[model samples]
Target chain A: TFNPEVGYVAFIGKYGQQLNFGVARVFFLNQKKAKMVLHKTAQPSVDLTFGGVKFTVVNNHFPQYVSNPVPDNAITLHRMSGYLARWIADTCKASVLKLAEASAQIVMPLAEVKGCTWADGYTMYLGFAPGAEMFLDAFDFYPLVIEMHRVLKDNMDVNFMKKVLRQRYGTMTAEEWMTQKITEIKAAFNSVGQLAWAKSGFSPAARTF
Target chain B: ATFNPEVGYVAFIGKYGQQLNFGVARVFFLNQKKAKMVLHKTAQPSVDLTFGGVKFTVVNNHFPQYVSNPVPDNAITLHRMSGYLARWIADTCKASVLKLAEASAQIVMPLAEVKGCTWADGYTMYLGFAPGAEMFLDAFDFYPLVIEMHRVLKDNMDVNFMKKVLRQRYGTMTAEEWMTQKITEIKAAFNSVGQLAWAKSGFSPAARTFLQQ
Candidate 1:
């Protein structure tokens, strides 16, 4: 029994029972949408689609042998997580720098998983792994969730940059154009951080944490 | 003097109206009185970094490009550092572009994302930190993943060398036998650790496996 509305994916079998009750939670803010996207991926692995964005899952079984005789088995869990990340960057029209930056955010948390993937206009992934005790226990996923939350909170209004996206910068590579656009984007984003720091009354030198 | 204590690095910026150069020093301040030294190898000759408020510099003739301006926050350079590591692994291990892509995948994933608010010149990369964004990079599981990647790629290289050696010595049978035996050995080891390595044994084993297979 699975409900796509609340981002709950259920596994209703013995294996699901072995999954600390076959429950996996989507760590993104758009839970319902993420769930439906996740459900769209065909059998064998969890493939997610959101808002017309799609990325496939590759199981890089950590703590296991890297090679598995089969070509289909070659994709490592961490690697697919990376692929999805790069795809997201491409989808977002982000620069190579942005792709690398977002990739790091998406892949780090799932390091402990059996497999994972990132995609869909957002920098995120859904991970499935064994270890009812370890996955359900010592693995601290809170930091991953909070990081995603912070990213979304900051990026929610970022579509304002889409207007600038339409403007033409003089002859330059995509990297240069992005660099110029990002310079503008930074100014737009920096005000909030600056204001927070200003309100805290902490000089740059005194600011810690 | 600029410091981002949260990310534990500081930068001393130098100036030029149209050009720039800077020094990046990684510093740690502690209340303790004891000191120790650690040694490492560098492919690029001179290395300048700080540890425990102690500054160390070595002379090397690597690249002039490294003299680019420094960012106070270590988080700013985390993505670029991973990119370098990925390339290094690819070159050193003679890994395929596919393998390199895999390595890049691991490296790129896990970088902390803040709004693209920080930009640095000369280096031509993003810099600075959003409020509350500094702590996320440190807590993220990036370093360990990099460590694991080194081990995995190195092991693959070693295995490939062994396969070539076996092929030269006793033909394909010996190499195939050795490979099969190794997987069996690993499966046995995994079972001993209370985990199973079979395609269908665990959660979403691999894309091709069905439960009964």
Candidate 2:
């Protein structure tokens, strides 16, 4: 009676592949004849080949709980922010100053979850396409798709992100990367409305319901 | 120029007889009003006004950097995760536990950031949100947006949380309290993407060509 086409099973099934999939051990997948790689290490940095596509894993220093002084979480966040900036700077050859500039101007909120490997870790990402229209057109490019997956995971709901994979990929499994993007986006949207409702004379139910 | 209509302004009149032409301020049209409000501390918890149609405030929190992390275990190091929660609690009464759940579930890399605020202490926040339609309404929902903003400010980049925000808000949780919180944040945050992304994304391609000299 349950539709596996788009459900939690698919979500777990996709990423929870056995330590072996296709030729790449550690459970990777391929749409055609390509292979997938895995990073079973902490903040691993390496190159990988899977399903005919090659990508590099840029694992750098993540947040470590500063127990010495027990500074505020803001200190931890600024630390993580620097780490992610360095990753993009070294890997993508981008500018950290620019990233810092961007950080100063926006109003966003984030949370530290229960299951993260790093007790004080944080993360940041960006999405790019040839063009808005072109990005939409060539959807099969794995890197682009992965980026899209990341985007979807941040903005939508986890369950919704899971459904996207099951329905679009026709595979009953979802990856953590995909689900996270969708959920983040949705959470942020809700916060804005809640803020408005809170400040204005509107009741919580008015904006919430 | 790549002028996106979807990327525009919002308008709102605050409860305090103050009419905020946020779009004009956001679009570099005017700043006199915002300057006064910022100087006067017009709103209580935050300064309420409009950017486009969505409304927002300069959220004030209980602590200079408030902390609301879950209990940690040996497997999980016990570090104080800041910025995001402080900003979230300061900005709105409702928080998204589901978004927190998904981020906890799929943290490939643990990252953190520290900030220095001129008036207040700095903090950290997680980032999550994707670019697509299936979650447009979810994007409209905005939990992902604020989290993304928080992450960008804290880390100067985006993280896996961006993706997780979209999924948990739109996919799971059935548009509940968490989902609603996200949507609201998105509206307010969207208006500031230009300001935030420029600060966080490290000279985005769009800004370099269009807004920058």
Candidate 3:
């Protein structure tokens, strides 16, 4: 439920049925601002109280609120996500190096594929693992998550980034993928540039100096 | 002369006789609407200004009144054009904003000194820090920059490059007008060359040996 004029949206559902909050309205002025907020609150789940409404952050569904094929802001948003994920590791007493060692079992399926695609869904799961782990009702994330995944898959060459990561880090465990691959993956996405995103209907105006 | 706002000091002493400490400012017969609008808008006025006593034009507005209106259209146009120039050089040579500023400073500062030119505080700040130059690095290829300047410079170092570009683009132009577009293109060229130099300056063992030969 996004209102373009107000520049905010929420996923509301019954507490026991699918969501942890009565409503989770995320407010932002623009896509760039949304990305900034998302980066600051880079947890999979952040406890928040806004306008007297309490909510638990589940997953970011920012891309759903705006029109896309305009992937520059999305790329920027996801790139920041990748950076924040590493930050989480750095500050949370875990290192990407250590996390990689622990996530072997989880990444086994992708490990077997020679040219597997790595998209936003993978980054969302990897970067926001903290919030992803606290799913009181996990299925609620499916639709939005799937939408974002499709956006990245269709617009971006996830396999290109995957190849770059594989070349640099070789085969790795799930933790390694999360810690090492996430940032590199996002960097590859960012390297695609705004000109390419402009073709997709995204505003290429320089918003930040 | 540099005005150091942070330190509350002016570097150059003026020869306007003795300075009074308790100087009171008074306004007589001020146009309230015009002053208020001009101050409120405070937009970058048309770029016809002096640099090192040489009159130059940077971004001359054809219709200065319309462009200086409070509607924000002119402001956007000015900023957009500025960014366009900066990005032109960055894309031409694949250089970062930092690299661009560094190179531009290297080129322009010495040129300014040789010409006995002095810069305004704003331009000086831009050269030193590159806050304005940063945005253009990501904007796009401003390839037309060199073409425009080529006409202005006329392949002559003596001619004022800024004056020509402004005259061609925005009618008559000169000093105090030398603020935005011209500097941006100059910065762009500097950035391109800076990146090219860095790329070519490989210090690998084989390259180093080849250079020695």
Query: Which is the leading candidate under TM-score?
Result: 3
Which parts of model 2 are misplaced by more than 4 Å? Answer: A1-209, B1-59, B65-137, B140-168, B171-213
User: What are the TM-scores, per candidate, against the unseen true structure?
Assistant: 0.18, 0.18, 0.20
Question: Interface RMSD in Å per candidate, to 1 decimal?
Answer: 18.1, 13.4, 16.8
State in Å the error of residue B25, model 1.
16
Q: Write the per-residue lDDT of candidate 3 for residues A141-198, one digit (tens) a residue.
A: 2222322343564554545334222222222443234644343333333323211211
List the candidates ranked by DockQ, beginning with the highest.
2, 1, 3
Candidate 2 has what TM-score? Answer: 0.18
State each candidate's chain A TM-score: 0.21, 0.18, 0.20
Model 1 interface CAPRI class: incorrect
